[PDB]
Design brief:
part of a larger assembly, 5 chains, C: mainly alpha, three-stranded antiparallel beta sheet, 12 helices, flat, E: mainly alpha, about 70% helix, about 5% strand, translation
Chain lengths: ~180, ~170, ~180, ~230, ~350
Amino acid sequence: MLLEIPYMAAHESDARRRMISKQFHHQLRVGERQPLLGPPESMREHVVAASKAMKMGDWKTCHSFIINEKMNGKVWDLFPEADKVRTMLVRKIQEESLRTYLFTYSSVYDSISMETLSDMFELDLPTVHSIISKMIINEELMASLDQPTQTVVMHRXXXXXXXXXXXXXXXXXXXXXXXXX
Amino acid sequence: KQVQIDGLVVLKIIKHYQEEGQGTEVVQGVLLGLVVEDRLEITNCFPFPQHTEDDADFDEVQYQMEMMRSLRHVNIDHLHVGWYQSTYYGSFVTRALLDSQFSYQHAIEESVVLIYDPIKTAQGSLSLKAYRLTPFEYMFEEVPIVIKNSHLINVLMWELEKKXXXXXXX
Amino acid sequence: LLGSYTEDNASQARVDAHRCIVRALKDPNAFLFDHLLTLKPVKFLEGELIHDLLTIFVSAKLASYVKFYQNNKDFIDSLGLLHEQNMAKMRLLTFMGMAVENKEISFDTMQQELQIGADDVEAFVIDAVRTKMVYCKIDQTQRKVVVSXXXXXXXXXXXXXXXXXXXXXXXXXXXX
Amino acid sequence: GRVVRLHPVILASIVDSYERRNEGAARVIGTLLGTVDKHSVEVTNCFSVPHNESEDEVAVDMEFAKNMYELHKKVSPNELILGWYATGHDITEHSVLIHEYYSREAPNPIHLTVDTSLQNGRMSIKAYVSTLMGVPGRTMGVMFTPLTVKYAYYDTERIGVDLIMKTCFXXXXXXXXXXXXXXXXXXXXXXXXXXXXXXXXXXXXXXXXXXXXXXXXXXXXXXXXXXXXXXX
Amino acid sequence: AQQAFKFCLQYTRKAEFRKLCDNLRMHLSQIQRHHNQSTAINLNNPESQSMHLETRLVQLDSAISMELWQEAFKAVEDIHGLFSLSKKPPKPQLMANYYNKVSTVFWKSGNALFHASTLHRLYHLSREMRKNLTQDEMQRMSTRVLLATLSIPITPERTDIARLLDMDGIIVEKQRRLATLLGLQAPPTRIGLINDMVRFNVLQYVVPEVKDLYNWLEVEFNPLKLCERVTKVLNWVREQPEKEPELQQYVPQLQNNTILRLLQQVSQIYQSIEFSRLTSLVPFVDAFQLERAIVDAARHCDLQVRIDHTSRTLSFGXXXXXXXXXXXXXXXXXXXXXXXXXXXXXXXXXX
């Protein structure tokens, strides 16, 4: 979940910088195509609800659901350190959910506030700015951050994109030439 | 008053009448289109099946409803603006045809009756007319029919013997 | 509607003119009152209240009503609830007066003449009666509204020009 | 089959079908009727179909085919269901799959593309039947065979066409314009998603050298750009 | 069978209950095959069916009580298919319990239209029985039914899109068969369902506050006054023991509907409104939850927005481009109005 969700979301974003596979992804797909959607009972359904909650950007809901799926399962109760892992997972989920949020909502948002985002994801700014900048640089996202005012920018580039397309076309042509030969 | 008849409407009416003529059974159908201003646009038609019944009561409302619904999935989605028939008798021989028109007029007072003659229609001479009832007086009168074709349609028609945004704006 | 009202004014008893004036000034499609005001029956001094209403709806703004409210049936309008339909119309007519003088209208000026909240202001501009009356572009960043018998004459001239323009466009299409 | 003849009515019917919607981007689909029992397929009538395309997938109304055909049969049993048409102007990626659907009604399926935009004067029609040449040592692969077309008319229609060419010899549209304006007021995001799509198509082609899919995507992107220009 | 199901409920044997149900399915499939064979149970006979139907009814009940909702939904169609074959009517007692179960299933299912339908089916059936019945229940049930219909997610479909593609929603609903399954001629809209709510019998026993709410939101909705009206109306519901109970469980969807309407109306009123003002204009649980709602409304295409977090402003549409196509869209509307007006004038000409 933690691994494949932000990469899925981005794909939903359609930036498609990288492709990632997340376990239990197939099960989630089956649920979506299900005629009936019940409130979670089996553990995979609690995990599932946590996933969709991550998609919509409610991290609190997601954290809640894992316990709810877990409680019937007793899955997290079988570890001696369970508290520690609860808080640790709470943090990692905070991070990845912040990522997911940013991925899905960058379409309609041209600009952002690191202070508000920091408070609302319960993630200190040092983490926020880091995650966002890292990701943007890694995915080649047309996004710009002013560290001084702590603000972000998106929704752009056209000229560059066209240049890329041209390159691809050239490649295809070369291939055809091979066959012709 | 003017009835504008489209390319497919005119060709379907001539085709159907001639097919009807081989049958020896009179052919009727419905005209689809738009009442614009006084003027009426006939953009398409469809044939009604041959009935044992003559003139009025010929119409099959189950056939009509099915055909209209299936066309609607089709783009045109156009009001029934009247009916066409092929009737041999001339001139103005039959009383019975007119009453049909009264039924159409009661449904929609703007309705038009077109009559085509598939036997006397010959190259250089289409024999067709369009009528409405009058509102010692005569019962009905005839309005001349013009033809509307797009530039695309004109090019298409020229393949015989070959040797959308715009329309909206207009 | 002007036709129907003029025909009625010139056939009905003079006693029916006050009600006709209330009807005209409450009618959703009517913004021009000059032809009605100019009617000889309309002209008469005795229907002083009616004449005042005509001046108010033919020539004045919302401000002019406020100035004269103690001598016009503002109170009667309040009792009736007629005024709000009338109040709305006078505010619409005020926008028309402003647009005659200037094709760019600052929000601050409108609000004072409007006597309405700036946030609301756009809503009032937004409302359809206003839209039919006026076509304009709202500039929130610059806080302005760009709004590009006597009036009828001018309108006529415009219409003629408009037709010519449309013809040009059609001609081009026909060519293609 | 060696060749195809098409009646002028079919050309005009396809154009009329396309015209009512008033969509440049949209491609309309329907049924053709006539006689395919000889080496010359004669296309003599047609009717429109409800049709929608989402992504690769497209929906055709099977019940509509059966119900309209049944009425056609009551008018004239001589005009058999022999294939389908669309407004093109070119073969599309989904066409071999759509063609497999029409095969159920009749076989072999025949596809008439009617270029209702009429970019090329010589042909308003391209005709195809599905067949596979095959590869030795490998399973046969389906493909469209291009058949020559001519426009021909029975006497009735000849008379009709000559009569029509004698002199030579809006709310929906407004709504469409509004939609175009809305697209324009949004085109910065649709640009960036058409840039990606274009790249995708290129990728597909590369794989082929999938290729067809990529090509289709590229075409779609181009179409979307053209529609943006027309709106402007 | 009845004994077996009671066993499953009493000992929470959920895994076995599911298997029990499947066994019952296999048994019934056999009978149709069996019927051709001699000595087969006669699915033509009413007593035989009444027994089978009675079992499936209980299957639905236990399913709900064991919170096995997916199994519940499967058992509902099991029940449905038997009712179609059914000649003799079921006991209204056992039938009303059935509908009272469907309301729970569909509340959990998130299918609010089916939820309200099931409520209505139960109300129509509980009105008859008891022959003498409490009026205090008719009060709360009718109110519940009505509130659940106001509380339904907006069914509105865009005009521009529909003509071109006839497309609305995501769109996909795997519980679509169920509408046909409830003897409904077709899936309804919330406006349609409401009209039944609109009808006096639902209205007559309906608490007054809800009728007012319906006015405030569905009849004459004005953002500049909605907050006040709701503030004065919400006190009354809380005080009532029964009204509050009906109300407590619909707070969320109701709030969603109201806020959706506020966002749409603000989209109509403004072009670029301050984030402070927009959030301020419509009440929210939290400022950030309000932003969440606004984006959700945008994704479901009830509004198009661009949110600039830098300046704290929201725009309901590069800058000049967005103004140009807004102008075009205004001009178009103006033309339409003029055209329509001309038509009206034609009539005046005759006068």
